[PDB]
Structure formats: structure tokens, C-alpha cells
């Protein structure tokens, strides 16, 4: 049973949601009135802080707990380590809540213990195009398109509680007042993703990885050798040699994307994310802001040709603590964010992410199956990893689609 997750408008099991057709609401509907004005009670000793995510103190109040707590590998061999940049980024967007920033500290010392994090998204999330088929079928197409219009709905990440308090029900009480925060903004909805299986994942994608610095990686024991490398001479040289990449970029036209790309870029983009089934929509404002080149953070690069940019990529950091390892402290990863190719194939696109990637001093580049990730792994060397990335509407029933089908990158 799931004590918390059972109470919640979500559904229960892989059976429910394999029974769903229609995309829409699970709970009674409810006005911002209904909700409590007040914060969830929880302990005396503690208190409910609003950080200031553009105060620079704060911001690195958040970075330890993070960098402390948040979420490691199953062997606990990395840690992911967010950077303070990375955090401001992330959780200040155009027209962010800072309500739905949400931490408890200790009342004594102010120290952080927890803490969860709600941004604004615009996402299109109706009934599945092969659903509004059979409902089509079946003369319900105006029931399948009922909730077809983008919808302002709020996407959690962060959800971090300090080791210490560990399974003692606060991640619950956190969840509960963060709902309270984003209701009382006349909110309904939210999207989150996890590593873990909750109730209940509307899609769930494999991990991907292209190896960009092989002997650092198996140094850190994140990749071996494989055992065909074996009965070869000396492997460190044959792994090096099966990875390697150019030096610059292949595409003649490539370039950093400028502010003044931000229209075009937004046109190729919601072009494309418009083919999937579940996918953002981004006003000027929030492509300047995702997409903008931002040192040690992101890092975004357009084809333009006759002076129109006809493609883009990105990717963004986040290092890793190595917890075990002499050697390394950090291990240093760059994850594919979005792009659009109108003018190359996909995998000719992706590779000068890649040969950019290795070229800033990158080790890794990673992925989930989601856009059309899957259609350049093989040729660009990317393997599967261990972790399912799983995806989770709050109050939003939904049936379950493919990981291809979901344009949603989430940080
Ligand atoms: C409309 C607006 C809606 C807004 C909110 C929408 C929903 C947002 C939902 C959150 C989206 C987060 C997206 C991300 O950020 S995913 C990343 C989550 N963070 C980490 O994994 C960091 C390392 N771990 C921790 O900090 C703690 O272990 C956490 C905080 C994960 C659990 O703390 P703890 O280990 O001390 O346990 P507990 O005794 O306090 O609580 C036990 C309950 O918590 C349920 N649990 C465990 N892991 C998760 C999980 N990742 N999402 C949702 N629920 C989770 C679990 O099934 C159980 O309930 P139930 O099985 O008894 O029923
Ligand atoms: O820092 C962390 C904590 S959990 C996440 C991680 C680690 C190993 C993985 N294998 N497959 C997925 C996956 C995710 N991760 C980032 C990462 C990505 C690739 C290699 C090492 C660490």
C-alpha cells in the first residue's frame, strides 16, 4: 500500500491507467477559496521558509542541501551536484511563483531539511492523437478534444529531504504543501518525472549515454571495458579510439545561438514539439530564457544558412559528485535539451553536440528516449544505462504512451 500516494488524485495502479482514454482532470473540481489559506501545520521545532531564488545566499542554501541529499545512483557511487547558476536558471523562469518554492528548516538555526520546487509550464497535454482515433471511431471525438487547449500547470523537481529525516513522512508533507501553494495560485494540474516507479507513469523512457572521456569513466567505475576488449591487446587505447571525435563542428553554419535568433529558434521548435503528443509551448520570453547561451550552464548552437537559422541544438550541465574514487571528485555531464533539425538529419545534428560537448571539457552526454532521441543512438555510440526515467501527471488522467511521444525535457 502507499500510505500518502493512496490518498491522492492520481491513478493507483498500471491497471487503471491502461483502462484510460480521455485526458482530464481526477478530482472534484475545487476554487482557490476551497483551499486553505494557511501553511500546512507541521512540527513546532520547524518552520516553512519561501527562499529567495534570486538571492545568492539562499540560492547556496539550497545548493548544499541539494549537493548533500538529493539524488544519487543505485550503487551510490554519483550524487548529481547542481550548480547555484544551474538552480537559478531552473527555478526562476518568465513569470516563475516564488510561493511554489517551498523549504522547511529547522526553527532553531535556520537549517534547510527539505525542499520542493514548482515552475510554470504552458503544456499541451490533451487526449493522445491514437486515442482521438478510436474516439473518432466511436463518435467521441468531442469528449476526446475536450481538453485539447495548452494548459498553465506547474511542473515540481527538487523534492529533497536531508538524510537525517529520512522516512520519517516529511516528502508527504512537503508534496501537501506545495499542492496548497500551487492551488491557492487557481493551478490543478502538475507534471513531474522521477527515477523511481509511483503511482502511476503516463510514460517511462530508458537512459542513454555517449561516452566522451571513456578512461575517466571507467576510471570512475561508471563504464567497464566490455569483455570483447578482452581477448584485444591494450583496451584503454581501443576504447579511446572507438569514441573519439573531431576536433570543431561539422556543419559549416554552425554557431552560439544570439538573442536575436530567439523567433526563429521558437518557430522550428514549436514546430516540431507540435508533432508530440505531450509537449511545452514557449513564449519568446521562455526560449530566451531555456535556450540562451548561459556559461556553465547551458549551451545552445543554431545552423543558419542565408542568414536563417534552419537548425539548433542544446544541452546543459549538471556535474556529478563521484562518491567513492582517489582521483576524481566531479564527473562532468552534459544532457541533450532541446533541438530541431529542418535541414540535416537528426544524427549530423547531434554529433556536433557531441564534438561540442567533448571539446568543453565534457564526459558524458546523456539522454532519456524522449523526441526523437532514439533515432541517432546507435550511430552516435550511445548505450543504455540502468535508470528508467518514469513521467507523472498530478490530477490529470491520462492513458499511457510511449516515452517517443513526449516532448517535456526536465531538468
Ligand atoms: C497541482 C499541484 C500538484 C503539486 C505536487 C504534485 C506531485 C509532486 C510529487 C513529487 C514529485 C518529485 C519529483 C522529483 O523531485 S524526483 C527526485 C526526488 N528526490 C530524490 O530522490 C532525492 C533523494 N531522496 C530524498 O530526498 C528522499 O528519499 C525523498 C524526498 C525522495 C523521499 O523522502 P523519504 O525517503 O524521507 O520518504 P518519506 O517517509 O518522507 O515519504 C514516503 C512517501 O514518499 C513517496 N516518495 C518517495 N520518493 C518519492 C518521489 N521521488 N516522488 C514522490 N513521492 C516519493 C513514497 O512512495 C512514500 O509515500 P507512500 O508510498 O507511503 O504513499
Ligand atoms: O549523479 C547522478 C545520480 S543518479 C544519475 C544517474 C547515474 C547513473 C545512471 N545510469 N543510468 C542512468 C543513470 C542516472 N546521476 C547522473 C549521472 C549520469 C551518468 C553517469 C553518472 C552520473
Not at 531539511?113 to 466511436?138: D, H, N, S
Not at 529525516?165 to 522521477?194: D, G, H
Request: one cysteine or more; hydrophobic letters at 40%; proline letters at 7%.
Amino acid at each position: 500500500a502507499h500510505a500518502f500516494w493512496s490518498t491522492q488524485p492520481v491513478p493507483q495502479t498500471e491497471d487503471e491507467t491502461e483502462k484510460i482514454v480521455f485526458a482530464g482532470p481526477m478530482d472534484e473540481p475545487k476554487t482557490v477559496a476551497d483551499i486553505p489559506e494557511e501553511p500546512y501545520p507541521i512540527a513546532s521545532t520547524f518552520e516553512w521558509w519561501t527562499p529567495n531564488m534570486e538571492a545568492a545566499d539562499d540560492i547556496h542554501a539550497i545548493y548544499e542541501l541539494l549537493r548533500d541529499n538529493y539524488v544519487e545512483d543505485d550503487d551510490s557511487m554519483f550524487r548529481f551536484n547542481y550548480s547555484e547558476e544551474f538552480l537559478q536558471w531552473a527555478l526562476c523562469p518568465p513569470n516563475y511563483i516564488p510561493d511554489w518554492h517551498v523549504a522547511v528548516r529547522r526553527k532553531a538555526d535556520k537549517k534547510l531539511l527539505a525542499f520542493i520546487a514548482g515552475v510554470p509550464v504552458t503544456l499541451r497535454m490533451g487526449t493522445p492523437k491514437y486515442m482521438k482515433v478510436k474516439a473518432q471511431e466511436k463518435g467521441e471525438g468531442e469528449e476526446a478534444a475536450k481538453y485539447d487547449e495548452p494548459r498553465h500547470i506547474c511542473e515540481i523537481n527538487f523534492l529533497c529531504v536531508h538524510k537525517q529525516l529520512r522516512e520519517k513522512r516529511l516528502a508527504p508533507i512537503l508534496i501537501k504543501e506545495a499542492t496548497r501553494r500551487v492551488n491557492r495560485t487557481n493551478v490543478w494540474q502538475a507534471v513531474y518525472t522521477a527515477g523511481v516507479l509511483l503511482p502511476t507513469p503516463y510514460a517511462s523512457g530508458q537512459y542513454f549515454h555517449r561516452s566522451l572521456n571513456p578512461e575517466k569513466l571507467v576510471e570512475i567505475r561508471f563504464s567497464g571495458i566490455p569483455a570483447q576488449y578482452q581477448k584485444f591487446q591494450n583496451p584503454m587505447a581501443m576504447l579511446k579510439r572507438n569514441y573519439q571525435l573531431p576536433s570543431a563542428p561539422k556543419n559549416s553554419g554552425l554557431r552560439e545561438m544570439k538573442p536575436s535568433d530567439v523567433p526563429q529558434v521558437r518557430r522550428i521548435l514549436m514546430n516540431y514539439l507540435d508533432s508530440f503528443d505531450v509537449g511545452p509551448v514557449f513564449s519568446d520570453a521562455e526560449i530566451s530564457h531555456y535556450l540562451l547561451p548561459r556559461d556553465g550552464v547551458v549551451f545552445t548552437y543554431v545552423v543558419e544558412n542565408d542568414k536563417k537559422v534552419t537548425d539548433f541544438f542544446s544541452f546543459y550541465r549538471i556535474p556529478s559528485t563521484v562518491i567513492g574514487n582517489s582521483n576524481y571528485n566531479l564527473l562532468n555531464a552534459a544532457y541533450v535539451h532541446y533541438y530541431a533539425a529542418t535541414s540535416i538529419p537528426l544524427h549530423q545534428l547531434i554529433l556536433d553536440l557531441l564534438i561540442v560537448a567533448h571539446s568543453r571539457g565534457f564526459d558524458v552526454c546523456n539522454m532519456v528516449e524522449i523526441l526523437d532521441n532514439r533515432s541517432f543512438v546507435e550511430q552516435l555510440k550511445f548505450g543504455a544505462g540502468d535508470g528508467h526515467l518514469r513521467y507523472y501527471f498530478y490530477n490529470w488522467a491520462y492513458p499511457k504512451i510511449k516515452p517517443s511521444q513526449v516532448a517535456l525535457v526536465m531538468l
